[PDB]
Symmetry: none
């Protein structure tokens, strides 16, 4: 099994991402992917409930084969804090997949004149880090399985 | 595209350097594509900086490993930023690459010296660059002095590897 860690600030949607991926619903865990030819099993750890414990995050990053690092496209601070998480991963570690989650609210946010992190900011930040990038919605399921497959393919190298 | 990172202490003028270079103006991650003519040929640069991330040593190192070259800035009117050049060079040499040492804000040297404030003379900048085998240049993001020239000098050394 490949050990995959979900990290990012509280309230970015880590628990929701896992439930959508594993149980297909919105309100460690095991996940079998078919990646290219092969059956590929993931063991999925998350830092939800424990985000403030740097030592726990760091320990997870040490045992990780790969990291899914979420921010929330509607929460600017969660995107600013990506630097805090990546520094911890670079020190303790591994493929990183940067995920702009909650992409489904962007239209609502935009309509009501509220600020969202544009996707190209995430693409560019991810590029500087040598990280993959993906926008997802744990709510409507969009890109959820695809983000994890893109990470798994990079881990299998 | 050659990958070029700007580094150095906060407030040395990394953003201002990039904005002057890429947009010819002075007023997420700073990230710009820039085409230069180096000798005969078109040469594409992928440029970013460590503004907002200076205190993250693991990220800095990751950036220095990924760079084809570094523009490393200090502020000629701020001695501490110059002394810290030695910390930055250690990280760059530990990580990996051509370095261009840039003494930025050269336009303020007269204002500093008029007001009794200490500045780093270019001779000291050149001497530190020679210690490390780095290129050296003084620049001003504010008035545009030597900004493109610095980058071209680095790009030539990067193409030579
Ligand atoms: N609209 C929307 N809400 C989401 C999404 N993902 C999570 N949420 C909501 O964001 C809040 C925080 O989500 P949660 O999964 O608990 O985040 P965690 O703290 O990172 O584990 C909850 O109210 C979720 O319903 C998403 O993709 N879209
Ligand atoms: N006078 C002068 N000021 C500059 C120059 N470059 C940057 N600054 C100013 O110094 C401050 C820090 O610059 P900034 O680009 O944000 O530096 P950074 O933290 O390294 O990215 C800003 O207020 C700039 O306007 C320069 O060449 N001359």
């Amino acid at each position: 099994a490949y050990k995959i860690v979900l990290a990012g600030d509280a309230a970015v949607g880590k628990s929701s991402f896992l439930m959508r991926l594993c149980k297909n619903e919105f309100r460690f865990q095991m996940k079998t992917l078919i990646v290219d030819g092969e059956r590929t099993v993931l063991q999925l750890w998350d830092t939800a409930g424990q985000e403030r414990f740097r030592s726990i995050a760091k320990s997870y990053f040490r045992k990780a084969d790969g990291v899914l690092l979420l921010y929330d496209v509607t929460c600017e601070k969660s995107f600013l804090n990506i630097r805090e998480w990546v520094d911890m991963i670079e020190d303790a570690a591994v493929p990183i997949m940067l995920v702009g989650n909650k992409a489904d609210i962007r239209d609502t946010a935009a309509t009501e004149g509220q600020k969202c992190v544009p996707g190209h900011f995430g693409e560019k930040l991810a590029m500087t880090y040598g990280a993959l990038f993906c926008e997802t919605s744990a709510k409507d399921g969009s890109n959820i399985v695809e983000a994890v497959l893109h990470l798994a393919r990079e881990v299998k190298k």
